Design a protein around this ligand. Structure first.
Ligand SMILES: CC(=O)c1cn(CC(=O)N2CCC[C@H](C(=O)O)C2)c2ccccc12
Ligand SMILES: [Mg+2]
Length: 117
């Protein structure tokens, strides 16, 4: 169950799954930068969402070797999705985009997680 990974090998394996999310347009656009509640006029955002996450943060973490094992990366992507599903209404554009991104990610990440072990 224990396994160590070289950060550079994780980067090469996982980065295509991240790039896949960025390539979804329009669906990735709400997720490319951290939610700024003041700028977006959603002042309750940080009361609802205790641990924000977005693609730019995940990309930086992947580039700077902050993921030592693949589930740490997967956890951040899922956190991003979970936050958007929590904060936004089911009828909303962002919620619907999130659901689409989650489908893309599942298809991308499963073969990678199999290959990494
Ligand atoms: C990720 C997330 O929850 C949100 C992210 N945004 C920003 C958003 O949807 N944007 C701003 C960034 C460009 C996006 C676009 O061009 O589609 C629209 C929200 C706005 C209102 C409520 C929630 C969000
Ligand atoms: Mg489309």
């Amino acid at each position: 169950r224990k396994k160590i990974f070289k950060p550079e090998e994780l980067r090469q394996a996982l980065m295509p799954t991240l790039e896949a999310l960025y390539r979804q347009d329009p669906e990735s656009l709400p997720f490319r930068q951290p939610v700024d509640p003041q700028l977006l006029g959603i002042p309750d955002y940080f009361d609802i969402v205790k641990n924000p996450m977005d693609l730019s943060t995940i990309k930086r973490k992947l580039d700077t070797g902050q993921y030592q094992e693949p589930w740490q990366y997967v956890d951040d992507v899922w956190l991003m999705f979970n936050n958007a599903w929590l904060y936004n209404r089911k009828t909303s554009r962002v919620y619907k985009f999130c659901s689409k991104l989650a489908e893309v990610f599942e298809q991308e990440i499963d073969p990678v997680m199999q290959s990494l072990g």
